Enzyme design. Sequence first.
Site, PDB file in Angstrom:
ATOM      1  N   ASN A 187      17.218  -6.816   6.745  1.00  0.00           N
ATOM      2  CA  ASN A 187      17.470  -5.278   6.833  1.00  0.00           C
ATOM      3  C   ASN A 187      18.858  -4.881   6.790  1.00  0.00           C
ATOM      4  OD1 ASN A 187      14.714  -5.227   6.596  1.00  0.00           O
ATOM      5  ND2 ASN A 187      14.037  -4.768   8.598  1.00  0.00           N
ATOM      6  N   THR A 199       3.832 -12.735   0.581  1.00  0.00           N
ATOM      7  CA  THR A 199       2.663 -12.681   1.618  1.00  0.00           C
ATOM      8  C   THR A 199       1.467 -12.155   0.974  1.00  0.00           C
ATOM      9  OG1 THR A 199       3.437 -10.342   2.069  1.00  0.00           O
ATOM     10  CG2 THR A 199       4.998 -11.981   2.821  1.00  0.00           C
ATOM     11  N   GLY A 232       0.954  -1.163  -0.072  1.00  0.00           N
ATOM     12  CA  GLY A 232      -0.125   0.022  -0.092  1.00  0.00           C
ATOM     13  C   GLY A 232       0.976   1.317   0.015  1.00  0.00           C
ATOM     14  N   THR A 233       1.058   1.782   1.400  1.00  0.00           N
ATOM     15  CA  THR A 233       2.066   2.887   1.183  1.00  0.00           C
ATOM     16  C   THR A 233       3.386   3.035   0.669  1.00  0.00           C
ATOM     17  OG1 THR A 233       3.009   4.419   2.736  1.00  0.00           O
ATOM     18  CG2 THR A 233       2.768   2.372   3.305  1.00  0.00           C
ATOM     19  N   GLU A 265      27.560  11.280 -10.379  1.00  0.00           N
ATOM     20  CA  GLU A 265      28.508  10.360 -11.105  1.00  0.00           C
ATOM     21  C   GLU A 265      28.123   8.871 -11.175  1.00  0.00           C
ATOM     22  OE1 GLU A 265      30.564  12.083 -13.595  1.00  0.00           O
ATOM     23  OE2 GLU A 265      29.133  13.395 -12.447  1.00  0.00           O
TER      24      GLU A 265
END
Lengths: 79, 425, 425, 439, 50
Positions: free
Chosen positions: D228, D179, D144-145, D254
């Site tokens: 993460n 999921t 969603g978000t 660059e």
Amino acid sequence: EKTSDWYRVSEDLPARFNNPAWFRGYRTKEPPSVYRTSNQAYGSRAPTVHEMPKVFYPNSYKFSRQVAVGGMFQNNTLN
Amino acid sequence: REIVHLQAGQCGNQIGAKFWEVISDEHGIDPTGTYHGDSDLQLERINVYYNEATGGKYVPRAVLVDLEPGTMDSVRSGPFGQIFRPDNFVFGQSGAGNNWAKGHYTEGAELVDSVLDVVRKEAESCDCLQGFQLTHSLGGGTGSGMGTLLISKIREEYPDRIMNTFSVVPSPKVSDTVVEPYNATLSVHQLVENTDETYCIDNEALYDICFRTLKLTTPTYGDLNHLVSATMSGVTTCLRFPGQLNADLRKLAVNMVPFPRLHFFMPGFAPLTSRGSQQYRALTVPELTQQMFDAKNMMAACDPRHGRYLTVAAVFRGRMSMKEVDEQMLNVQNKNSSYFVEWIPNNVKTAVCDIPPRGLKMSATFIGNSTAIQELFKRISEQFTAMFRRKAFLHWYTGEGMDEMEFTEAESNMNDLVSEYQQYQ
Amino acid sequence: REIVHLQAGQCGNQIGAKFWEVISDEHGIDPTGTYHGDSDLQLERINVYYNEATGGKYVPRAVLVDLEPGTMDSVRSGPFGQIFRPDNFVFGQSGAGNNWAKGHYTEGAELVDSVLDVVRKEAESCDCLQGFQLTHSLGGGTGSGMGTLLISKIREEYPDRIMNTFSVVPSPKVSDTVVEPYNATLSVHQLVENTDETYCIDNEALYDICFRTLKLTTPTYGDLNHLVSATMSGVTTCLRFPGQLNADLRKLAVNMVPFPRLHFFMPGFAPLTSRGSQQYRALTVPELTQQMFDAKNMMAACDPRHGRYLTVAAVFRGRMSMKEVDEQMLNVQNKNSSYFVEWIPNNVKTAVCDIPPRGLKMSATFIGNSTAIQELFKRISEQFTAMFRRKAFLHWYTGEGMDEMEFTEAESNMNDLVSEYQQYQ
Amino acid sequence: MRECISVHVGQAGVQIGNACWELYCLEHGIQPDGQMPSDKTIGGGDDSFNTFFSETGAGKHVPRAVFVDLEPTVIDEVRTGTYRQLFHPEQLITGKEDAANNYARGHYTIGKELIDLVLDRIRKLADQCTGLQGFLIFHSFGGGTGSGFTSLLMERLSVDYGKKSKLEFSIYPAPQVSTAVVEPYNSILTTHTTLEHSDCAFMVDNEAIYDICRRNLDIERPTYTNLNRLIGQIVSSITASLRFDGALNVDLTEFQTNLVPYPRIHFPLATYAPVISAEKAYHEQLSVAEITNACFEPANQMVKCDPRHGKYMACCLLYRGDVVPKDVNAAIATIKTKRTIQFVDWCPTGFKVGINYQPPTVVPGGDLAKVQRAVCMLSNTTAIAEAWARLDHKFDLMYAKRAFVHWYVGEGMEEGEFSEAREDMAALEKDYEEVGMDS
Amino acid sequence: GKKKQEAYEQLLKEKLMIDEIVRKIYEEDQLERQQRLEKMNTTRRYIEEF
Ligand SMILES: Nc1nc2c(ncn2[C@@H]2O[C@H](COP(=O)(O)OP(=O)(O)OP(=O)(O)O)[C@@H](O)[C@H]2O)c(=O)[nH]1
Ligand SMILES: Nc1nc2c(ncn2[C@@H]2O[C@H](COP(=O)(O)OP(=O)(O)O)[C@@H](O)[C@H]2O)c(=O)[nH]1
Ligand SMILES: Nc1nc2c(ncn2[C@@H]2O[C@H](COP(=O)(O)OP(=O)(O)O)[C@@H](O)[C@H]2O)c(=O)[nH]1
Ligand SMILES: [Mg+2]
């Protein structure tokens, strides 16, 4: 509790890196509890002497900031 | 985010009487309303299912509806029943009679105004409301009749708010109410266009899972209410606790309702042991994933093996990695892919929460949208039309303002409902 | 590597029970589930015949299956009893009057569906699965019949795992059931159908073994069953303990069964001395070959000195030198030249494990496909012939849903095998 | 000076971020909550915090980030955790109701409620920066978000800062392991933003980093934390030059003109090299040679896709630590000497390099070992159309039967848009195949 | 931070303030039970005396 005793000191890294006992904002070892979210594992334990990086090479723009003010050299003069 | 609780009927009141026990067993609220300090992550989101009171005390946002005070003489006298606020106790003087017509038409209007007034007063005391929810009975008349009167009334002034219901469905094998197929085909006619989500609770499913799996020697209604409240507290866990992949009640329906007339689901609570088999079982993820497919511990009494799953969601409670949640679930996708729809390799929502209930290191509950609901619906329609063809028990409805055009249109979209499952099989 | 154990029938279940003790002690699990043992060479491979249970507990991988309910209680009320899992004790209500029929077409059916479900969980759980395993007799609907069903069904869901039925072939002199001849014939067909290594044991031989080598004055089924337990513990040894010449169940089959139809083998423990000669004897690889071949030992009542030894195996345990084993094995293959088919002699297959049997410097088990088994399938065929001719106790087998042709197809298969053996003598 | 606002939108971001900012504080000396634990007044000429941490006026070293998510559950966890005193209460924007897996509830209805506050914060966080190289948006390319709000913001970040940069570290809808069931949809429509208002999308699929933890590391049963920390180390190696010094350093501007070719093919990969767990290291010699050879190795890519199905267009190699220039060149030679690793017919040199000096940061309580070398190889590959294929195919297995399509249309998205999206990806699909063809 | 604590003891002071009067409700409610029962019996003894 000192990295010069255990590691090899680099002689130029800041003395903040020399002892990690000053990182006192971390958790105070409250394990076992059932209501312990897995997202609380972010910085769950304080970094010790065995974590601290060996060398540190910062970018001093102190020479750059004292010159970049205003403008560069421009020849408005009468030669 | 918050969800209010509202219940109508004897079966609704009895289920919620121990639902408020199991939801206060997690939040740590004694049967007066004060906190028992156990964690900060136990009251940081207590606003969702509880309201603040005059210091310390936490009042539930529960309104209780019935036409008799008989079931309300026991919900207040229970071990945890002093917690309710008395102005929400809305009751009538005369009972209904397990009939839809007298509970929705003639004595409905004398009580629906008072219930709609008090459910608006609680709704105005909110910061941000995700929706409403109901527990009621389809076989009866107070839970089915006025219960779906409040379904239609609330949907009028709250259209954009998700509203699910937890209804017990009429029994396959042994009946309780003689006129129960009349009540269901009238109620199911109304909930199919109004409720965003609904849950089927078979009583023989509760008896099958209490005999074969958990193995109670003398089951009573207390343990049945424990199992229906656990999966109803478990679906909505991500509202009130943090998780590394959460799922509130609104993310569920957009994920499991692909068609607006297709929202009849199937709940289930995963870890269920006896007093003997608890010890001989390691409680981890691979033993819990492929075990939920086993129909013996299913809570449906109509297995998907004579049907087809459409979309299934499981929210997991506890500290577990979802590598093995995904790896074992894909292991129970590819091994049995015929019973799933073959055009989606992975038709599964996996949701996680980090706060498990007490006494279990990890827990789980799942919600399933399958075809075998139509096996319940086809059988209850032929049960209804077997006695509707001979005008058997019908004058008790026509004496309270009921003609035959609404009944022949209640079976009409029921026949359209059984028609919209065969092509997806 | 892992192996499930489906003890069906009384002969089978009671044999399974004693075996689980002789598999526990060796690994070190106590009569509850805790590892109260010694070295790590005892828990490094508790994943094969055993599983895991929250809290250092080890449940046996077993699917106890039998009709007469009494059997299960006896196992539970026995020694290592609570070790087995409660939801794996799948038992039945009405018993099968020693009718291979009832347990294949009548009772067995209703339960067979369930049995396979429990067996599924066990196998589905583990990833690898060397093979399954079954312990049964061959003279009663429970083991002889129900089993053949629980072997057919299993072979068609898992058709690559090594099946292994340690059946107890019907006896010549020591009989017990008059419908035993029938019970066995109608069964061998299903074993000759799909079974990788059906080890055949005969109560008769086991008895003599206890009345000459063990010098026991009164052998009770306990002792007679223990001897067979050693063979069930000496084939899977190279799968759960170290070794210098490893040889698992599959290997043994490939380097034993010649044509895909001679899967009937005979057993034999090695250091089986009376308590009054263990003092006068000297366990030495040699002395573990005379007490290994000498007809007496072979537990099948088919003196191999009559026919020929198709393929012989010797999974020796203990700590011996292999030059010694190899030599003291060649001496045999050579010397006795006739038995080992002279034209194509099958250099005996030899394997050496180190972890020995609790308290026995050296040990060994013996598997020898012999072209003499004929004089066992044959006797059961002369007993079938007689009764079948004057349609004997057939009004019970026919009165179960079975026809008569079935019996002729049975007799055919057996004598077909009897020739398939003689065609190698 | 060289600074980069780090935006984290969606639970996925807030989480990868809570991992990025610990590998950003522990990299320097920033304590859990600012106040650099200083002592001996002896100066240290740092100035290496001016790339991610902005000094306030009382030693609080506040982060230049902007965490944003409708659901107020993942952003409240940070507002009451070990880092409760790092971010300004306003820089952690939150809402009340989530986007419940719906691109609509992110770029149409709700979203609008916060796309004004979030932009204002990014604005007031832009006028205090003296060198806005470019934004580092962290969103889920499949939720969603994640897709909803990113569209809104990414668009409202090109209608203003325009001439700038927007690097995106997005999670990629995995092949099988998925999921969200409304995921296939929530992605073919988020390509209507990345293919236009972006600059480089280092897509990283969960499945890959859900097996590299099993093969390389031994961590069996890995959770999001582990994922993460790895998707939080690549960003460090890519943003190191803007702070720590070395040899041939590379700024963001660059690192783009030495990678993204035609104005569209800008979707690279990412492969940290010395990811071996400690147990192993002791037995191996992570050297420039192996660190680089074991970078172009199928079973090491962060997105489940075969590299031997597409010619590598460009390859920006960002090395860190003791990397003697000579050794780097040697590897690049051997790499082109190999034949399995094929390049394009429009990039002889193709590969670009860079050597910073700071070693790899070892987040306390972690899985990655303490190596003195490390090389993040951002790799542009034509095979990315493989992970793009599956998605389009699955999209057409659903939009063909108007499946889970009412929920979206209801919140505002004429079914016409879904189709306009399908063809959008048809273009980028043809594009990759096309950019492989040679004269 | 101390103002947050000082506001917490205001609720704790107020916690016992309601519990003071909730006791008074139960104390009052028991009084009419005795007031009914006394009126139960003084009407008994006078109904039989007549
Ligand atoms: N690799 C990785 N992916 C994550 C992590 N957390 C969430 N995700 C991704 O996020 C997806 C779940 O949906 P999200 O994008 O998080 O949805 P959301 O950001 O919460 O947005 P709404 O649910 O609409 O409020 C999964 O498919 C994951 O790929 C993480 O910690 N690591
Ligand atoms: N799970 C559960 N079901 C109940 C309970 N009490 C009644 N029921 C179910 O409710 C059905 C009858 O509902 P009924 O009493 O007529 O509802 P009412 O008309 O609203 O009072 C029966 O089939 C019961 O199985 C309870 O305490 N728990
Ligand atoms: N060798 C051996 N024989 C047994 C054992 N238990 C039972 N038997 C014999 O096996 C024969 C077959 O019994 P079985 O078929 O299992 O009886 P059923 O289950 O009632 O049909 C009986 O005559 C028993 O004497 C045992 O543990 N070992
Ligand atoms: Mg979210």
